[PDB]
Amino acid sequence: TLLINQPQYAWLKELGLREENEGVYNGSWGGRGEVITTYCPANNEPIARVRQASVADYEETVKKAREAWKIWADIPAPKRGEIVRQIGDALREKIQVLGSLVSLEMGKILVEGVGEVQEYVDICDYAVGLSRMIGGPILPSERSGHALIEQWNPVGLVGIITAFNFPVAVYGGNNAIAMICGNVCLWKGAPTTSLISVAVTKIIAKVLEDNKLPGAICSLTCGGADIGTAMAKDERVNLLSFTGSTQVGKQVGLMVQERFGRSLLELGGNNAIIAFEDADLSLVVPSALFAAVGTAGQRCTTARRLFIHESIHDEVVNRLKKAYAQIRVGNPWDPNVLYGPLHTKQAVSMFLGAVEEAKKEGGTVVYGGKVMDRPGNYVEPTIVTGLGHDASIAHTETFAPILYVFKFKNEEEVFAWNNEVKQGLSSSIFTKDLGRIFRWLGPKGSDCGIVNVNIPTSGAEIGGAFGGEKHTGGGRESGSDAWKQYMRRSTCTINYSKDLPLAQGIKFQ
Amino acid sequence: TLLINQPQYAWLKELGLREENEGVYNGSWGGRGEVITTYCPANNEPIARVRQASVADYEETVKKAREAWKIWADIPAPKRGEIVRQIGDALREKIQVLGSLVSLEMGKILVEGVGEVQEYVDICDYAVGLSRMIGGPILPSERSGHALIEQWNPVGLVGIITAFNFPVAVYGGNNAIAMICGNVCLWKGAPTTSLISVAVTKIIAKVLEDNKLPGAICSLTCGGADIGTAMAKDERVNLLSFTGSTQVGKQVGLMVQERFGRSLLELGGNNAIIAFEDADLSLVVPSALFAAVGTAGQRCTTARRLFIHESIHDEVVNRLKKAYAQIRVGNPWDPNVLYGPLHTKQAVSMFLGAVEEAKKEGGTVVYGGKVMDRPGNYVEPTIVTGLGHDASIAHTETFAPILYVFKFKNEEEVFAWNNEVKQGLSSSIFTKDLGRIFRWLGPKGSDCGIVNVNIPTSGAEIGGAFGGEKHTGGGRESGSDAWKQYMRRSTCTINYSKDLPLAQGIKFQ
Amino acid sequence: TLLINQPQYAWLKELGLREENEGVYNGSWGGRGEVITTYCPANNEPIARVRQASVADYEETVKKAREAWKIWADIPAPKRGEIVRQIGDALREKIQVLGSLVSLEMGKILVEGVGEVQEYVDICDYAVGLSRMIGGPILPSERSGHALIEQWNPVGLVGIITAFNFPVAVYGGNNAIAMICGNVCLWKGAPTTSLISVAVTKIIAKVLEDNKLPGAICSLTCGGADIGTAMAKDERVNLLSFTGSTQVGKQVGLMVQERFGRSLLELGGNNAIIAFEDADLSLVVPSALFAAVGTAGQRCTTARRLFIHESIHDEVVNRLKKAYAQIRVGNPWDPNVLYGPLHTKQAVSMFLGAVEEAKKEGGTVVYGGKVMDRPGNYVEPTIVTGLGHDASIAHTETFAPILYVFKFKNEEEVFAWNNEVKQGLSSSIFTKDLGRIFRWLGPKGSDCGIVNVNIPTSGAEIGGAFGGEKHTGGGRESGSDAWKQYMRRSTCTINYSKDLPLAQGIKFQ
Amino acid sequence: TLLINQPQYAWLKELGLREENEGVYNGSWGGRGEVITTYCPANNEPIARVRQASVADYEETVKKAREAWKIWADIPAPKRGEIVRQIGDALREKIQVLGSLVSLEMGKILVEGVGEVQEYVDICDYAVGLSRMIGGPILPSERSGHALIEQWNPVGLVGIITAFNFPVAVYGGNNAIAMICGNVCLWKGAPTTSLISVAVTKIIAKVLEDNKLPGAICSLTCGGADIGTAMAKDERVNLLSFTGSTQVGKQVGLMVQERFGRSLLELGGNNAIIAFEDADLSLVVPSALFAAVGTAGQRCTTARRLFIHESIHDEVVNRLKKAYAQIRVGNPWDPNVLYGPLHTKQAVSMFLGAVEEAKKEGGTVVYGGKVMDRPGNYVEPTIVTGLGHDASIAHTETFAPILYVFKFKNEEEVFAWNNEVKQGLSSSIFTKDLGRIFRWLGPKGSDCGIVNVNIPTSGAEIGGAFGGEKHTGGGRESGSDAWKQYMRRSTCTINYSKDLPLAQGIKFQ
Ligand SMILES: [Cl-]
Ligand SMILES: [Cl-]
Ligand SMILES: [Cl-]
Ligand SMILES: [Cl-]
Known part of the structure; x- marks a missing residue:
């Protein structure tokens, strides 16, 4: 055997x-x-x-x-x-x-x-x-x-x-x-x-x-x-x-x-991507998907929080939905598989408990949230909207592919929301604003060890x-x-x- | 008043x-x-x-x-x-x-x-x-x-x-x-x-x-x-x-x-000075006296252990004794005074406690050891010989002017005796040997943050x-x-x- | 006397x-x-x-x-x-x-x-x-x-x-x-x-x-x-x-x-400012003025060439022309004065020679070009349009306040026109385009020792x-x-x- | 053929x-x-x-x-x-x-x-x-x-x-x-x-x-x-x-x-080795030989001047002469060969001229000095004593294995004699004296780009x-x-x- x-x-x-x-x-x-x-x-x-x-x-x-x-x-x-x-x-x-x-x-x-x-x-x-x-x-x-x-x-x-x-x-x-x-x-x-x-x-x-x-x-x-x-x-x-x-x-x-x-x-880590109103959405959507679901959400630098400006939040979420649907699932050795299983059954029980907590904390599962009906520790890559940025489950590191999506309006508040968690590993903003980019990199910007611009939270070398x-x-x-x-x-x-x-x-x- | x-x-x-x-x-x-x-x-x-x-x-x-x-x-x-x-x-x-x-x-x-x-x-x-x-x-x-x-x-x-x-x-x-x-x-x-x-x-x-x-x-x-x-x-x-x-x-x-x-x-700190046989004793003796008694033995970088090669041990100890006797004691603000008081009455009790403990542990007081009969917290700068390098009182930081003097024969054992204590602040060797100097600065040398040659343990800028x-x-x-x-x-x-x-x-x- | x-x-x-x-x-x-x-x-x-x-x-x-x-x-x-x-x-x-x-x-x-x-x-x-x-x-x-x-x-x-x-x-x-x-x-x-x-x-x-x-x-x-x-x-x-x-x-x-x-x-130096179509024009116009006329155009870092995108060229020229008319001229030790004399009488002559040579090469003086009717070596700060970027006088350093203005259309040509001169001291682009900025700072960008963004050619500390x-x-x-x-x-x-x-x-x- | x-x-x-x-x-x-x-x-x-x-x-x-x-x-x-x-x-x-x-x-x-x-x-x-x-x-x-x-x-x-x-x-x-x-x-x-x-x-x-x-x-x-x-x-x-x-x-x-x-x-290069009275002569002689004759004297870093303290001068020359006589000459691909030919016949002619000239300037060939009777461009590795440190031929780089030897007494003069030539590539002292070593490396020491201690002039990595x-x-x-x-x-x-x-x-x- x-x-x-x-x-x-x-x-x-x-x-x-x-x-x-x-x-x-x-x-x-x-x-x-x-x-x-x-x-x-x-x-x-x-x-x-x-x-x-x-x-x-x-x-x-x-x-x-x-x-x-x-x-x-x-x-x-x-x-x-x-x-x-x-x-x-x-x-x-x-x-x-x-x-x-x-x-x-x-x-x-x-x-x-x-x-x-x-x-x-x-x-x-x-x-x-x-x-x-x-x-x-x-x-x-x-x-x-x-x-x-x-x-x-x-x-x-x-x-x-x-x-x-x-x-x-x-x-x-x-x-x-x-x-x-x-x-x-x-x-x-x-x-x-x-x-x-x-x-x-x-x-x-x-x-x-x-x-x-x-x-x-x-x-x-x-x-x-x-x-x-x-x-x-x-x-x-x-x-x-x-x-x-x-x-x-x-x-x-x-x-x-x-x-x-x-x-x-x-x-x-509890890493955030922030998309400002001026971001290239053709860059944001693939960047968020791959950063959120890569390694079935089991990177230290996985994107777990996605802050989208109000005026583009619905479009980004819809585009992310149409994209998640095309994530190809299989055994991790199978050629051209993007997405394999979680490492243990215990991670699956952690995944389910998080989806449940989020749903009961007021979030909506717009995609995923379920175990897949197959051998191994497979779960659906999940997107959750409607949660408050200070929701308890979003401040917790659940080592599974759950992306919590938040609205924001202003720069100062969403920078603070990036910084408000206890983790401080990776962080990303998507914008074209030169001034905002350098504030993000400065003393009132991100408090993380990795501070990225127009590349998601796994951008490191x-x-x-x-x-x-x-x-x-x-x-x-x-x-x-x-x-x-x-x-x-x-x-x-x-x-x-x-x-x-x-x-x-x-x-x- | x-x-x-x-x-x-x-x-x-x-x-x-x-x-x-x-x-x-x-x-x-x-x-x-x-x-x-x-x-x-x-x-x-x-x-x-x-x-x-x-x-x-x-x-x-x-x-x-x-x-x-x-x-x-x-x-x-x-x-x-x-x-x-x-x-x-x-x-x-x-x-x-x-x-x-x-x-x-x-x-x-x-x-x-x-x-x-x-x-x-x-x-x-x-x-x-x-x-x-x-x-x-x-x-x-x-x-x-x-x-x-x-x-x-x-x-x-x-x-x-x-x-x-x-x-x-x-x-x-x-x-x-x-x-x-x-x-x-x-x-x-x-x-x-x-x-x-x-x-x-x-x-x-x-x-x-x-x-x-x-x-x-x-x-x-x-x-x-x-x-x-x-x-x-x-x-x-x-x-x-x-x-x-x-x-x-x-x-x-x-x-x-x-x-x-x-x-x-x-x-x-518990800083050691090491004098090898080839050392310039006209450099060694003043350097040790000043590093041991400066600030009445209350520097973090005070010389508290003095290792002397066995060939020159007795000469250096007797020259130190004759030098300690010329230390000018008085009020710290008065001209030409080199030696003032300990900071607290409590420190004087610590001093006597260490002098008694060292006597129990087999050490011999060759200079000082007592409180001075004058106002203030004045104690005699003290020299102790005969202890083993591993005596407990010598491994302890007593924030008082007590200098523990040891013999040694070879370089490897005396480098290890430098490193054997829990403290790792300052250290000095006195020698002319080019190879010994670079071994002291190398991976099998001193483990301290300050590693000096031909300048005592308060050498730092x-x-x-x-x-x-x-x-x-x-x-x-x-x-x-x-x-x-x-x-x-x-x-x-x-x-x-x-x-x-x-x-x-x-x-x- | x-x-x-x-x-x-x-x-x-x-x-x-x-x-x-x-x-x-x-x-x-x-x-x-x-x-x-x-x-x-x-x-x-x-x-x-x-x-x-x-x-x-x-x-x-x-x-x-x-x-x-x-x-x-x-x-x-x-x-x-x-x-x-x-x-x-x-x-x-x-x-x-x-x-x-x-x-x-x-x-x-x-x-x-x-x-x-x-x-x-x-x-x-x-x-x-x-x-x-x-x-x-x-x-x-x-x-x-x-x-x-x-x-x-x-x-x-x-x-x-x-x-x-x-x-x-x-x-x-x-x-x-x-x-x-x-x-x-x-x-x-x-x-x-x-x-x-x-x-x-x-x-x-x-x-x-x-x-x-x-x-x-x-x-x-x-x-x-x-x-x-x-x-x-x-x-x-x-x-x-x-x-x-x-x-x-x-x-x-x-x-x-x-x-x-x-x-x-x-x-x-023969330093160029380049203003792209997306530049902040309330930044471009004063930066250009002070960098061109500061020290009566007698800095090594003085702006001598101004490249303006075809779409905004006439507006920027017209706004410079209105701002040049308000430059306060006088004795350099009077604190209301922005604009002092040239250093020598020969310098005044060479100013006039360069203005004349610019006219002969096809250029139009849109502001200034003449000596001031007052004691001392005072000339009017001068703007010349209509020269080709490879006009001989534009490639010459004339230590006088003469700004040669050029149109351009695309980034690659105007970088090349920045780099085409023999001098390589300072250079500046005004633009909000994130990619353009890092291309300007990279291997196909400015060939100068000082390469600035949204600050003129005199930006140096x-x-x-x-x-x-x-x-x-x-x-x-x-x-x-x-x-x-x-x-x-x-x-x-x-x-x-x-x-x-x-x-x-x-x-x- | x-x-x-x-x-x-x-x-x-x-x-x-x-x-x-x-x-x-x-x-x-x-x-x-x-x-x-x-x-x-x-x-x-x-x-x-x-x-x-x-x-x-x-x-x-x-x-x-x-x-x-x-x-x-x-x-x-x-x-x-x-x-x-x-x-x-x-x-x-x-x-x-x-x-x-x-x-x-x-x-x-x-x-x-x-x-x-x-x-x-x-x-x-x-x-x-x-x-x-x-x-x-x-x-x-x-x-x-x-x-x-x-x-x-x-x-x-x-x-x-x-x-x-x-x-x-x-x-x-x-x-x-x-x-x-x-x-x-x-x-x-x-x-x-x-x-x-x-x-x-x-x-x-x-x-x-x-x-x-x-x-x-x-x-x-x-x-x-x-x-x-x-x-x-x-x-x-x-x-x-x-x-x-x-x-x-x-x-x-x-x-x-x-x-x-x-x-x-x-x-x-015109690189000097300096041997002080306290040098390890078992290190000096083989260091001098290999740095003088390696590559048939055709390194840029070849030792071409050897200054020896007058107390040890005759001993080092005599010992160097006995070591030169053991140098194994032959085809450079032969594994048992230490010493091959010069690169060209013009190099041989230049070698002969320099030897001829050292004699005309008052030097004595104490070893070598002749072209070898064999196919190829072989010359004998050569030692010349008795020249003044400022002899014109000794200030010349002859890209050949000729070693000019000089006496010296004190440190300041011999540091000056290292520095007096127009070349400035490599230099070496052999000494145990800690102060002399750090003076050699300081502002009044060697003026060369390579400044070595107890390793000859070809020492670089x-x-x-x-x-x-x-x-x-x-x-x-x-x-x-x-x-x-x-x-x-x-x-x-x-x-x-x-x-x-x-x-x-x-x-x-
Ligand atoms: Cl998309
Ligand atoms: Cl003494
Ligand atoms: Cl304006
Ligand atoms: Cl030998």
Whole structure:
């Protein structure tokens, strides 16, 4: 009954996967914890099994990673970059089958699974350049005969906890940067994407092994809240990068702060698109649809709030209706499918409860709102009108494809409505007004970490720092100087002179 | 019997001080809370009184500061820089009386009180330049017809909590940078330095009023832990900069994390100086004496651990003893005085407690150890030998002039002994070895935020970023790109093209 | 007869000017060269006299400046910044009287004379911040045990040759930046603003002398082409900053290149405003007027070409013509005056020659074109329509208030017409079209050094780099990283390891 | 008789080379100029022939390249980076055979020919990262409602003239950076390395053609001084990067300045090693040998002057002499060979003249000094003692393996003697003294663009900017912000407000 035991899925063997897989890697492969079975959300058929990390597995792995760091931190950053370049090449070689596994185990369509691996590849190639660039300024000291330099050094062991919905590229972006910065990494992925975690780790392990480097530089301990909480409380985890829900991230951030650790938090979003009266509606309508229903509404940056000016609200909603009707639904591997299932049955129960709450909170379901009659966790992409902007269900992140539509009249109020929620990840306005565009980007504009113009809430690329404000947690990944989160700054004064301090009346010999 | 009503202290009136002072400023002066009397540590005499903030005062002041932010954030940063320049000039015009008050109320010697004001002056002129420079990169978007920009905007209200021992410069450094970054500020100083806080706030308030700006841009609510806790829990305080003990700062850090606020923590130190065998002892001995006993051992960056190579240990300890005996003790404002009192009677009890605890833990007092038989809170600067590097009392920050002296043999063990404590503020090696110097600055070297060579643990200037790692809290102030902690980053994609998204098989209108 | 000997000009003595002034400063004041008398262009009366440098004066001054450099380069940059800060304050003290001398000797209106001194004051404060920031990155070496650092050091003597039209701020921007970068300076200003050069040098000389520094750090050798050509050919002039005509600067740049010196060239402009059909016309018309007629059309950044979409050309011409008729003309020191005289009588002749040449090339004078019937060098601000965009006089820089107006239809042609001239200083479009704006700023847009949107060609502040492309010379001044032009970069590899090179089969002892 | 027509050289076919090769590439391959034969400098045998560019070929190619630029500059820089990434992979595929061609046509040993191709590969991977990073800052405008941005755009066509001695890497470093910066390129390499230029261009042309890009993006016009001069005079060549002798470079720099073009000059070197009394002589001697004789003395960074403290002078000379005698001479493809031929018989003649002249100027040949009796252009590596530091022949770059040795006593004199020559490329001190090291790196230290400590004059890596000062031409290649030389800066003010200019008394509409 395991999919991996069917000849239809023998391609999984190109990733080194078997019926039962080792979920711990620290140079060697193991796993003494519970055996977890992951399921394909398009049909709820079991794929394969992974033995997770026990507490003893975790302790062994943290110890091995930290010993490996003594070797890794001594390797010049450009030479660390060369390792990451080879990881990028190893991913390219497997991009089709790795992408297919993301689609199989996670549920997003194949082009998005392939594209997520491509993003990991691209950030490896970016990090290769960074490995010759990271550092700080030499500054002019006010003291004659002294140097003043800003040094950056690795923090040590970087723990990386990741969510189900980007089960490759979040780890990859953290891993590529943390590596060139001279850190070792320990990955605990979402339990429901355990096979992806193993497969990616097998690819990296082979590159480390081929370069005669200890594999614990990129360690893996598959587990759930038990292992994740251990990482949050473990003083040996110098930086904990956590991508996940706000509810969990809040508690992790506390536990790290309690031990004076460092955290990088990438939490929830409740992202708004705003269409002003002057917007190109031929741009707004497709932008809102794809941002709202992409990955079946399971991106951190999914559009969940759509503010439309009064004079165009009805036309935009009607055009969005005629468009949603053409969303093509199927298995995420099926060619030319735009829309697959939700990741779990629990997300379906969350979807239904949200549609119900919205309907009872005064909203009207103008499209969707129902479960589809088919195997897997399929729900209709949903649009809801008539809610107040402060409706409770619209302030909540429901990780499903529900787009709440609101009317507005004026700029100042709709900017405030963007900002009024607790999340602060992504935000978008559609307009042609030069003045409004620069106010949106200024101090009285959007309060989010991603602030877009005429591109929806998923508009991001690896060149910029990625992350959100407020309850999204403040962390940044990928571009700009995000690399500084993975290193420690020191401000260093070097007296190279023979000058003695002033004696101040004291007689020194 | 107030010092301010005596003719010798008439100069206090040049700071605008009176017998009883209002300790709340927000555009208006006030204070309905408890009236505190502050005392001169040189003679235990009361100086003057300050009416502190009630809860109502705090509430009104936070509201007024955030209303003023609407005006202040709209002022272009170079014009905010011009205000900070004028603050710098207002400080210059009062530097002698203000530095005299620092000596009087806090107890450090006059040149250090005056020096502390000069530091604030210097950061203002630094910030004037920064006000024409802050911002982020325009980056090359991978998308045709798109721009990609990193924007920086004020966080809003920056609450600033400061310690007794740098009662002017810590606030000033936060103030100048937060101001040019577009924030309004709210200051709660240490209660035992309330008159200094009032005096500084009067100088700034005149500059704001003279420029027809709302005074709440730089608000003041004097108080103790009750006001500080309110700030730590208050979602309207967008950034809380806290300078103080690790014990208090850990709870402030957790309160801010609880509400997904931002914190900048500048906490405890336990700084080591390391003298290798090849060191210039005519540099080592004065450097250690001054870093250990300056400000009566009450700098965050005070030298509290002294590692001496075993070949030179005895010579350096005996030269230190002979140098300690020549320290000139007296009233902090008197000429040629190098050593004044501890800040509080309580600190004297802490001093004796540590001296007794170190004797129990096997240490030998080779100089000092007792309270001085004279008015004020004067204790002898103390040298303790024979302790193990891992003695508990040596791992503890005792904010008193006690120097723990250790032997060592090799570089690796003594670097680890530097890093083994929970604090991570400042550190110094004295050596001529080129390779040792660059290992100390590298990944297997010092883990502190300040890493010095041939200058002691108080070597730091405003051009670099100032702060520590580990239990020192991680925040940075003053120079380099410390300014980014007072602002929020956004990654902004602007589609300026008329290109439509790919239809992906959907028939849009 | 000499204006300085008349009571109503006694304020000149506040700048330290006499009937006859020394034009050479190197610590001493001298001048064995030709005595020049400078005239007031508003009444053609002589002001005072300056004794210019002889060759012996020039030789002696270069030697004294390079000797002073030995002291000046040893002063830490932040302390060099403190000298520059004091220059800014010294200029602040004399801003009104200095701005009035600029108006008297050069002819610009008082608010622009004062504003010029203000711009020098502003770049001084900017340079104070820069003096704690200049430097290069520490970079990660690919070689184990090596450091890789980019150092920046002063080039030595920076010669500064300036033009008549900005006789304070061009020097000041070069001076303040060169000084904090550790260079000494040698100034040769325009001969017709010799009194301004002497007055500025007297202000700086006092600051240097008061700070016990050698005055040759900011040397002055007043003179004409012969002194300027000497500097161009002098190997001891490590960097020659030249501001002037394209015709002279081309020969200066060739002479410096011949000796492998460094040159910073700030040459002519032929700056265009482009108004598209969607432009805000209440913005276009005043922006065009003030940018065309400001400083009597004698700015490097003066608008000389106005491209107007065919649909709005006649309306904009008619509205400019009605606004030109209200320009208030008079003595440049009277505060109601917007429009002062041209700098010389030859300038008036060349104005008339250009008007005549425009008529011969087919152009129609729709406003102005004639000399004003009053004492001084006053001409009417002039608008010419009907020329083709490639008319020879339209491609010539004529330093007079003549605005050539052209029709256009489409964006691509009018961008090409902006770029077709040999000059490449400033350029501006007025439009609301978001895409047009970013195309103008991109690779197929303006080819100029200053590229503005909805602000005219005179829009520039000190925070950015200032300069042009093509025949404008490529130099940059003031902001961003323009400071690098005043320093020499070194890429420095430091082997701090004990490792030996590979023997490669050679037995070394 | 052609080597490519002999069967032992069939590997040259792997590079696409044949008996007679087209030396023009612009999308099509051609060449109507003179047919050049290139010769193996190890045996003077002809290898193959290249058809060089006529003037008509040049004209057509410039035109086609500027046409290609219209497409290329519209490609987002990260996507141009992907093209450069593919160039790096294509070079990897041919690195052994391309390295072998470098040894065969140019004459450097095999590890260095491969090492040269590797350097290009590394700069490609660097450029890939830079392609998501290049740009300038957003700056805070002093004007309300305005943005201030620094934009960087390609200059257009970058002509690249390269020298014989790094026939792959100098072009590749210019090409990789210029390409990601949005420029098209036109290469004219040295005529004596034409086959290498063709081989590299074939590798790039396949990548461009496989990506359906116009091949003129990387154009090739093989030829001599005629083609090179045409490039220096050609206004359509927006930037001319010239690597070669100072003698030719000076004339190129003058021709480019005459037309207000941009040049990037990488000219001659006269690089000194300085050994202080405290140096590690086990590091000094092999460092001096390999830096003096590597590449048969034909690096721009070759050590040509060796200053030794008089206390250790005789010891280092004696030890250097014993190491020189072990240098292994032979065919540069022979794996056991350290030392191959000079590039041309004219190089041998120049070598002999310089040796003859060092004797006439009072020097003593203590090792070498003779041409070797064998086929090819072999000369003995040579050591000359007893010359004055200012001997004319020692101030001359002779591109040959002659090492002039000098005594010195004190630091200040020997720093001056490093700096007294007209060249300014690389420099090295060997010392342990911390203060001497930081003085070497400061304002009174080396005046060169490369300033090294305990590593000889050839110590550089791609992460840093590479180039020299004074007669070395001032240009920079490769790392840091060298990319700025391939682009044009604009400083851009964008008024997005509806604020109108102040009327200044004028009544507008
Ligand atoms: Cl001593
Ligand atoms: Cl539609
Ligand atoms: Cl040897
Ligand atoms: Cl008008």
